[PDB]
Design a protein around this ligand. Sequence first.
Ligand SMILES: C[C@H]1CN(c2ccncc2NC(=O)c2ccnn3cc(-c4ccccc4)nc23)CCO1
Length: 331
Amino acid sequence: SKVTTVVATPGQGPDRPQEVSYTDTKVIGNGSFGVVYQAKLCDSGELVAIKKVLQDKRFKNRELQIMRKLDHCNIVRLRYFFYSSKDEVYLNLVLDYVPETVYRVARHYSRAKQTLPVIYVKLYMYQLFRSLAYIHSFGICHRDIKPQNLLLDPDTAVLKLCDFGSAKQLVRGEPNVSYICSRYYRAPELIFGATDYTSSIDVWSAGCVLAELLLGQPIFPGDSGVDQLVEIIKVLGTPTREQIREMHPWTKVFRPRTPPEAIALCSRLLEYTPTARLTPLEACAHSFFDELRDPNVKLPNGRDTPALFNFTTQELSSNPPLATILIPPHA
Ligand SMILES: C[C@H]1CN(c2ccncc2NC(=O)c2ccnn3cc(-c4ccccc4)nc23)CCO1
């Protein structure tokens, strides 16, 4: 077994490097992002993911700057970072390992001609909304919400948002690129080429993930923006002049046994008007998640549900009175 020893800087806290040794290094992902590895830390025995990207000499890495300041139970944790080396330098992000993704779990169910039990749809969606409530409180927009970027530990039912390669602090009056976000999950303002969009593009993407988990397939597919806009229009109806300036019965969209609270939540996330969409914190508070607030709720495997109510002042800052719903009496 090959052991690699590096001098890495801890993610959170002041810049004080340490020797870090890891082994059992294997490639687990390859794409436009770069390469993701799996490895075992020699000291603790803990599994880690290592995202390796090409580092520009000219500037500081935006993903690293964002990740160093994030601390949330539903966001993948940056343990360390280090630089490595023809004649080019790479930035390596040592993250907490999470074994599965919502993409892979949902695909197991789709191929088996079935849908993910609604208890999981609530757990995953609720935890995704918490992660968005947290990043959005600092003005940070993920800009790439999709099932592959939603990590899962299937045994504990914990969801962790990953991939901050497109994330950016959105400042009012500053223009932003419209070519971020993956096909199927782009908000209609991004399809229309808006550069003045807000963090609500993340809420639309999350609404696309929710509808997909309920349906067993993407709600707005299409290989072009015009095809995707046709699928959006089939469900939401034709956008008014006011709606276009700002950027079908929903019950007939899903299978008959679909909970009406789930359908009501989709209609409030998937709206043409960016300001009409729910905020992540308001989505957390929706009646679709009431089952998670029940003191007797348990996972299908018999275990207790993960931490769902440990809200901080920062997390609640968008609407502090929502704490009366969000933190139930038993919590
Ligand atoms: C294909 C991968 C791409 N991947 C990413 C794309 C861009 N930047 C980062 C990541 N990954 C991560 O930040 C990440 C952090 C922690 N644990 N972890 C496990 C796995 C994983 C990798 C392969 C198969 C299953 C799981 N990926 C991660 C997201 C998942 O799907």
